[PDB]
Design a protein around this ligand. Structure first.
Ligand SMILES: [Mg+2]
Ligand SMILES: [Mg+2]
Ligand SMILES: [Mg+2]
Length: 800
RNA sequence: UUCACAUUGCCCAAGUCUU
RNA sequence: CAAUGUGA
């Protein structure tokens, strides 16, 4: 239960399309290359500090040693020809404007054995060899540019992309080495992120405070100003000799004091310095408990410090405006980068005789046929998606819900959302509900204005007790408000009542499209079936009972230290497949492995049997958001968790488990080669484009599938990787199955970018995160209850 | 909080050392 | 899901 299956075959389905991928072929020599371990003392040093130490050491000891190594920034060094070593250590003493370095060889890396693994000759790809190659390609840019993850950022030359607040956009590129069916590939993609301007602190103060210039004013800052500035620069580094800021003094430099005495005076006396701006305070740097101080005038923000904090609304707006790029525009920016990059020239890439193609790799994809969507009513109409989109005009829900009892609760101000507005909104919504098959048969049995989160629970309690057979509460919200989270806390977890919130602006001015999409959510929440896949058009897997599981963990934002990660798992409850149920848990901070999966799957198998009266013969498990580096760890725990659930249920119940990891967030981009193939304004590849050759895995079962219409920017083709498959799918069937599952998403008449089960799992997790707002053993149980839905909500699609 | 797509935020990675 | 855009 620990090795992924081989690729069973290649797909044959769909018309072919010519594509270019942001992969660049690598020509690698077959040689033994020599790996050395390293030790640098002290070893609490930053990665970049260590690189310097090796850099000098290499030029200092050039005679009788090293007479062009690469270095991974910690303890691994690679050379193209052997050193004067053996397994003998060599204790070296290096100096840099006081370090000791150990160099003990470890092994030989065979680039020969890598040609084999890329062939059918060898079963496995040797990670240690791929690791080496990565260090080679990364060595130069890790010192020229500023690394962030697997990317590299630098201030663009001649361009300034200021964000305000003392920030600006830096442009960069992702870089990674990947084996493939064809060759080694250099994956390159352009990116941008926020950095702090290396301007004087004085100018940094200005932009943060919105001064046109300093001297406005020459009075000491208001505490409102001194605090806001404290928030911006604390934790940043500054140079005079670099230092990190840990505090901003309360008193001006003229009257701030320390035991050797005014800050102004020490610079006046010791350093011959009279300060232009005594009225302003001082940065406290170094150790918080020690008493070092610097005035702002003698300090610069040191370059290369990424902005870890969230951008403001306007900074975000600016950032997007800068990096927004249609697919051709994006294809051209990667291309220009690679020609410019001059990978071949790099002297370290040369030491290892590596050659990189300057042109994007050509790959042949296939564009799969969309499934037909069956509707109900008397029409029993069939929708046919064109380019990943269809519509509901002249169509009714497969199983529409008749709404007899419902209510409206308006938390928008009466002045702003009038009874006319609500009445007109009710008129149109009823018109669209009729055209849609989910007839709202009469006016609401209750319609009252309210205010504040305080009125929610009593209102909803009154409703539940007063109106028998109450199906729905429509809730009008003024905009962004804590009432929403409250409405859902009470509705989902406290009273178990269906609610549908609507922004006030979408009530004041309705449209047929918005109301149609709104009915999609309502009908589902009330137990309806919007549509189903054309039964006779489904893959053979449906000939027997099968459950489709979607799973996902959602972790806390950057910089957060204590919030839990939220695991969510959903399972199909019919043979369509359309109706899903959901389980959800809180678990350890930033743990990807779903800890309580067995319990979650058991719940779903039980409810599947209660809904369908079948026991699944197969389990198709779509698992979102696991990266290659976590495949084995995740699969081991979660495959065994699914078996565990099955085994503790009955007998020998051993359905076939297919384990698929879905990755939407990678750096593979696909482009149309021929301009006549590009779709829409964004110029993206068409919905259904499938790639399972050339750029994919050399031995294992994986494929790219872009299942959605690209509206804007460059589409992300979702990657699927089969980690386990008891059911022995062919490439065709699984690719078609995955694609058809993208058309079973109930919130829109579109093919979405990942399978509905996986998509729902996101919605579920995000809803759990909403139940926990401002609430995040005894700690665990408190949160565990916050995300536990009512008994009456368990079997619903409340998350729609 | 009508909805999708796109940018960022999420596991891996990255990150952390005389006033 | 939140912020920000493109769209229906
Ligand atoms: Mg995730
Ligand atoms: Mg780590
Ligand atoms: Mg949005």
């Amino acid at each position: 239960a620990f090795k992924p299956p081989p690729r069973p075959d290649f797909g044959t389905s769909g018309r072919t399309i010519k594509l270019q991928a942001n992969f660049f072929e690598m020509d690698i020599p077959k040689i033994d290359i020599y790996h050395y371990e390293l030790d640098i003392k002290p070893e609490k040093c930053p990665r970049r500090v260590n690189r310097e130490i090796v850099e000098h050491m290499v030029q200092h000891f050039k005679t009788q040693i090293f007479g062009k190594p690469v270095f991974d920034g910690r303890k691994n060094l690679y050379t193209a020809m052997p050193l004067p070593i053996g397994r003998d250590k060599v204790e070296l003493e290096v100096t840099l404007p006081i370090f000791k370095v150990s160099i003990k060889w470890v092994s030989c890396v065979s680039l020969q054995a890598l040609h084999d693994a890329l062939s059918g000759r060898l079963p496995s790809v040797p990670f240690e060899t791929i690791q080496a190659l990565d260090v080679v390609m990364r060595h130069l840019p890790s010192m020229r540019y500023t690394p962030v993850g697997r990317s590299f950022f630098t201030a663009s030359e001649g361009c300034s992309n200021p964000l305000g607040g003392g920030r600006e956009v830096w442009f960069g590129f992702h870089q990674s080495v990947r084996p493939s069916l064809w060759k080694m590939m250099l994956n390159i993609d352009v990116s941008a992120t926020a950095f702090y301007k290396a301007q004087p602190v004085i100018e940094f103060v200005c932009e943060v405070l919105d001064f046109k210039s300093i001297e406005e004013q020459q009075k000491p800052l208001t505490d409102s100003q001194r605090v806001k500035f404290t928030k911006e620069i604390k934790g940043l580094k500054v140079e005079i000799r670099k230092y990190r800021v840990c505090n901003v003094t309360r008193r001006p430099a003229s009257h701030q004091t320390f035991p050797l005495c005014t800050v102004a005076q020490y610079f006046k006396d010791r350093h011959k310095l009279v300060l232009r701006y005594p009225h302003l305070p001082c940065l406290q740097v170094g150790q918080e408990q020690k008493h070092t101080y610097l005035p702002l005038e003698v300090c610069n923000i040191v370059a290369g410090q990424r902005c870890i904090k969230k951008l403001t609304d306007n900074q975000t707006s600016t950032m997007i405006r800068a990096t927004a790029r249609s697919a051709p525009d994006r294809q051209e920016e990667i291309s220009k980068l690679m020609r410019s990059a001059d990978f071949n020239t790099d002297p370290y890439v040369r030491e290892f005789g590596i050659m990189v193609k300057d042109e994007m790799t050509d790959v042949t994809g296939r564009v799969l046929q969309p499934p037909s969507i069956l509707y109900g009513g008397r029409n029993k109409a069939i929708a046919t998606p064109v380019q990943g989109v269809w519509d509901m005009r002249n169509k009714q829900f497969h199983t529409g819900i008749e709404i007899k009892v419902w209510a409206i609760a308006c938390f928008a101000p009466q002045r702003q959302c009038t009874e006319v507005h609500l009445k007109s909104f009710t008129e149109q919504l009823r018109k669209i509900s009729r055209d849609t098959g989910m007839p709202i048969q009469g006016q609401p049995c209750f319609c009252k204005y309210a205010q504040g989160a305080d009125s929610v629970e009593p209102m909803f309690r009154h409703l539940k007790n007063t109106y028998a057979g109450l199906q729905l509460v429509v809730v009008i919200l003024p905009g962004k408000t804590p009432v929403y989270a409250e409405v859902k806390r009470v509705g989902d977890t406290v009273l178990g009542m269906a609610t549908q919130c609507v922004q006030m602006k979408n009530v004041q001015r309705t449209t047929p499209q918005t109301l149609s999409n709104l009915c999609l959510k309502i009908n589902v929440k009330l137990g309806g079936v919007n549509n189903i896949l054309l039964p006779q058009g489904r893959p053979p897997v449906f000939q027997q009972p099968v459950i489709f599981l979607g799973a996902d963990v959602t972790h806390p934002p950057a910089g957060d230290g204590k919030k839990p990660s939220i695991a969510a798992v959903v399972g199909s409850m019919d043979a369509h497949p359309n109706r899903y149920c959901a389980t959800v848990r809180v678990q350890q901070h930033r743990q990807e492995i779903i800890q309580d999966l067995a319990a979650m799957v058991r719940e779903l198998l039980i409810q599947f049997y209660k809904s369908t009266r079948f026991k699944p013969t197969r389990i198709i498990f779509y698992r979102d958001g696991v990266s290659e580096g976590q495949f084995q760890q995740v699969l081991h725990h979660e495959l065994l968790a699914i078996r565990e659930a099955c085994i503790k249920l009955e007998k020998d119940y051993q359905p076939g488990i297919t384990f698929i990891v879905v990755q939407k967030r990678h750096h593979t981009r696909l482009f149309c080669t021929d301009k006549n193939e590009r779709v829409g304004k964004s110029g993206n590849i068409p919905a259904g484009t499938t790639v399972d050759t050339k750029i994919t895995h050399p031995t294992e079962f994986d494929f790219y599938l872009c299942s959605h219409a690209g509206i804007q920017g460059t589409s992300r083709p979702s990657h699927y990787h089969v980690l386990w498959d008891d059911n022995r799918f062919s490439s065709d069937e699984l690719q078609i199955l995955t694609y058809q599952l993208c058309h079973t998403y109930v919130r829109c008449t579109r093919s979405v970018s990942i399978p509905a089960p996986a998509y729902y799992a996101h919605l579920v997790a995000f809803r759990a995160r909403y139940h926990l707002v401002d609430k995040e053993g005894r700690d665990h149980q408190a949160l565990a209850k916050a995300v536990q839905v009512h008994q009456d909500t368990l079997r619903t699609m409340y998350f729609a």
